[PDB]
Design a protein around this ligand. Structure first.
Ligand SMILES: CC(C)N(C(=O)c1cc(F)ccc1Oc1cncnc1N1CC2(CCN(C[C@H]3CC[C@H](NS(C)(=O)=O)CC3)CC2)C1)C(C)C
Length: 462
């Protein structure tokens, strides 16, 4: 059950009251992950439903589901009783505050065997302990989080959440040195539960970030559950309340220093600030840049999303040069990876950028340039950024177990090259890093673009 100083903050009657509860918990050495995830999940569950003076409020209504101590305490007790009842700590000797792999596996198995047998893996709003207790449903990373929360409930202070850019697992033991898979990844893959992440680090997949993944402390685990808030009511509509809650909570974490080592949280906060700026706060650009700095400082500059977030912002704001520079930087990070069979999410992002986002942005620039009959299409550095993007993709492909490029990429390459005049392309002086680009260096800058030669080269077996 809950401590006395946890109870006095209830009932929660607004967003600010939730924020106050997080502020109180984050002031402790062990914020209570269970309590906090239960609260977020309760609030999400009830806010993420569709639902002379005007007959109805003319701007609609905002809502809050009051959260009574009696409701939240009961859910909390059900979780802690289930985990405590299922794990007998006397059977798992525990010297030095290090958990054994056997204990971690047992706690993992308790969570996993509790889950409903059939539900869509990509279902919204099943990320929190609320969903686990009240619906026995958790999404992939929600399983990992729940394992960590269960470990906290058992007093296992060394078990922590590990995150890549697309997967989650647990770390434990003397220095966070041990690792265990506890959940599934993607669709129709074969599961590795109970295994270490060593094969994934060695393979140099994006999915394991070559070992430069996030090893959370308790305050970062709080930051994760905040990032996991899902404001979506449906495809075309968001809860403003849940956007505000996530935004306010991320500022609280930011002020406390808890996003220092969390690039993706800083991108998420930048995106929210663009949508609804908070008076007196840093602008979105400052925050995207802080996320890149965090990745450079703590993660060897081996993350992709810090640069994708920045590129997205520039793209949405029609800053053609800056967007291309940021995508060039994303490719410069990916080139030092091998493309592996569970990296499909970042393949999809590169694909989309090369075959949809860049072509649209350059088409918009071309309309601007026509109307004015300087443009980014007249800037050789823009062209050089486009080339660096493709060069990094070709270099990513090199030595990978799955090919990346195929004929479907070639038509959009040719069209994007053609957006820049010969005289502009010919100003550049660059030595490519990939074999594929080196083998067409003359074609890329020739006055007449030879599509079929560029296609052959781009699709050559690497
Ligand atoms: C928070 C967590 C539950 N989420 C994860 O996807 C996640 C799960 C993991 F196990 C391990 C990592 C995970 O990712 C994150 C962990 N912590 C914070 N944020 C995360 N993510 C933000 C993320 C999704 C949204 N994109 C948005 C971004 C916008 C601009 C776009 N730029 S572009 C392509 O237009 O040029 C790239 C995509 C960034 C990455 C994943 C949710 C977002 C579903």
């Amino acid at each position: 059950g809950l401590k006395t100083a946890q109870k006095t903050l209830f009932p929660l009657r607004s967003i600010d009251d939730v924020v106050r509860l997080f502020a109180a918990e984050l002031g402790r050495e062990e914020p209570d992950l269970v309590l906090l995830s239960l609260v977020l999940g309760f609030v999400e569950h009830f806010l993420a439903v569709n639902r002379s003076p005007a007959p109805d409020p003319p701007g609609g209504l905002t809502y809050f589901p009051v959260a009574d101590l009696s409701i939240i305490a009961a859910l909390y007790a059900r979780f802690t009783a289930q985990i405590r009842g299922a794990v007998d700590l006397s059977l798992y000797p525990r010297e030095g505050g290090v958990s054994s792999r056997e204990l971690v596996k047992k706690v993992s198995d308790v969570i996993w065997n509790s889950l409903s047998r059939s539900y869509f893996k990509d279902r919204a709003h099943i990320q929190s302990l609320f969903s686990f207790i009240t619906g026995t449903k958790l999404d992939s990373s929600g399983v990992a989080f729940a394992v960590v929360g269960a470990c906290q409930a058992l007093g296992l202070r060394d078990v922590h959440l590990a995150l890549s850019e697309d997967h989650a697992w647990v770390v434990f033991g003397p220095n966070g040195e041990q690792t265990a898979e506890v959940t599934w990844h993607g669709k129709g893959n074969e599961d590795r539960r109970g295994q270490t992440v060593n094969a994934g680090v060695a393979e140099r997949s994006w999915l394991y970030l070559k070992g430069s993944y996030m090893r959370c402390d308790r305050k970062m685990e709080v930051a994760f559950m905040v990032c996991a808030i899902n404001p979506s009511i449906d495809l075309h509509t968001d809860s403003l309340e849940l956007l505000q809650l996530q935004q306010k909570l991320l500022w609280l974490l930011y002020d406390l220093g808890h996003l220092e080592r969390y690039p993706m949280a800083l991108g998420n906060l930048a995106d929210l600030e663009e949508l609804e700026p908070t008076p007196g706060r840093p602008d979105p650009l400052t925050l995207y840049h802080k996320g890149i700095a965090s990745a450079k400082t703590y993660y060897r500059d081996e993350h992709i999303y810090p640069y994708m977030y920045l590129a997205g912002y520039h793209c949405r704001n029609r800053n053609v040069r800056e967007a291309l520079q940021a995508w060039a930087d994303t490719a410069t990070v990916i080139q030092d990876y091998n493309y592996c069979r569970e990296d499909e999410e970042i393949y999809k992002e590169f694909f989309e950028v090369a075959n949809d986002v860049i072509p649209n942005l350059l088409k918009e620039a071309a309309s601007l340039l026509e109307a004015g009959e300087g443009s980014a299409l007249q800037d050789p550095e823009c062209f050089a950024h486009l080339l660096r993007f493709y060069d990094g993709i070709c270099k990513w492909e090199e030595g990978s177990p799955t090919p990346v490029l195929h004929v479907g990429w070639a038509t959009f390459l040719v069209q994007s090259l053609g957006r820049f005049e010969g005289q502009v392309r010919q100003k550049v002086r660059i030595t490519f890093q990939s074999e594929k680009m080196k083998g067409m260096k003359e074609l890329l800058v020739a006055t007449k673009i030879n599509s079929s030669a560029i296609k052959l080269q781009l699709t050559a077996q690497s």
